[PDB]
């Protein structure tokens, strides 16, 4: 199965991939919450500091690049956005390559690096839809099933892993528990309940299982009481946003129960992020769908099956042992 290391950057995990005849190196966010692959053009205008520390792409020096001429724009949940023009080229990832893959060459962005969106075609910022990277990996015979497994690995590990088309059965406990999707567009599953260090709360709503989000965002119906219980407090992050902070010097775990008996336990240290922000935030206040992000996902082994339209979950097992099978 093709597979890639995932490099912890702090807010995100990067995947390395090269583009074009001259194999121009990029490190881009591995994002299960979006569906388009895009790179930072060498001549782009970054809106916020240096968005060119994780590679750039110069279309003019790849003899295999072709612009498609159509414009690309996308907005993300954190209000960052990108503008560019679609093109196609050869892409190297996972120890393999795909030819004539559509991706955007971005000429202005407020994101800090490019993004490899590996989500469903329904969240592509395109009309008509097109074959994004997971679809092409299957179509070109690199994998038999449009599916991938995510192992962000422990806090402090340097590198996690994504396996395209395969599953490492050594890296979880119990059985993978398959969940159907509950969104028309996202890789989202039902969250049944949340027991945060003994304060238990009904949920019963969908959550996007999102590698491209740093922390986790849930409705006020859950978060309000927890903020009171844990001492989380709103402060301006300013201007006119605010987030919950928490004392950096604040035992136990938070358990997330899904359908079909799946339960993921997350140590409470995952909820103090260096001033420290709380690792729970409000999806209502931040104007995003509910999301379980990296602080959750480090504690799960997750199989995203885009053919079957399922997400399967099990408690992660941190181990060098490996037993990979095709999904």
């Amino acid at each position: 199965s093709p597979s890639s290391p995932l490099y912890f950057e702090g807010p995100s995990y990067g995947i390395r991939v090269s583009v074009g005849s001259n194999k121009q190196e990029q490190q881009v966010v591995l994002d299960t919450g979006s569906s388009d692959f895009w790179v930072v053009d060498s001549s782009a205008s970054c809106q916020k500091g240096n968005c060119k520390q994780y590679g750039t792409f110069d279309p003019h020096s790849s003899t295999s690049f072709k612009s498609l001429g159509s414009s690309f724009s996308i907005g993300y949940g954190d209000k960052s956005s990108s503008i560019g023009t679609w093109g196609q080229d050869t892409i190297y990832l996972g120890g393999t390559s795909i030819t004539n893959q559509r991706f955007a060459d971005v000429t202005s962005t407020s994101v800090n690096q490019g993004i490899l969106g590996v989500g469903r075609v329904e969240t592509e910022s395109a009309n008509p839809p097109y074959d994004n990277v997971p679809i092409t990996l299957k179509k070109q015979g690199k994998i038999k099933t449009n599916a991938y497994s995510l192992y962000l690995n422990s806090p402090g590990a340097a590198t996690g892993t994504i396996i395209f088309g395969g599953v490492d059965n050594a890296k979880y406990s119990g059985k993978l528990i398959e969940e159907p999707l509950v969104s028309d567009r996202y890789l989202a599953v039902n969250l049944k309940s949340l027991n945060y260090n003994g304060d238990n709360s009904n949920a019963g709503f969908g959550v996007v299982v999102d590698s491209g989000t740093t922390i986790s965002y849930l409705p006020d119906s859950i978060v309000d009481d927890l903020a009171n219980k844990v001492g989380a407090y709103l402060e301006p992050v300013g201007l006119g946003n605010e987030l919950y902070f928490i004392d950096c010097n604040a035992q136990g775990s938070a358990s997330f129960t899904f359908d079909n008996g799946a339960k993921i336990t997350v140590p409470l240290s995952e909820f103090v992020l260096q001033a420290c922000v709380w690792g729970l935030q409000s999806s209502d206040r931040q104007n995003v769908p509910p999301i379980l992000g990296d602080n959750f996902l480090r504690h799960a082994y997750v199989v995203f099956n885009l053919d079957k339209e399922t997400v399967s979950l099990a408690q992660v097992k941190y181990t060098s042992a490996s037993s990979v099978s095709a999904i």
Binding site: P11, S12, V29, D31, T32, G33, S34, S35, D36, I74, G75, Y76, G77, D78, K79, S80, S81, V111, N112, I115, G117, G119, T123, S125, D210, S211, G212, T213, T214, I215, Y217, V277, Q286, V288, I291, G293
Partner: peptide, 6 residues
């Protein structure tokens, strides 16, 4: 942090 598509 970041929160990745609408």
């Amino acid at each position: 942090x970041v929160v990745x598509a609408x």
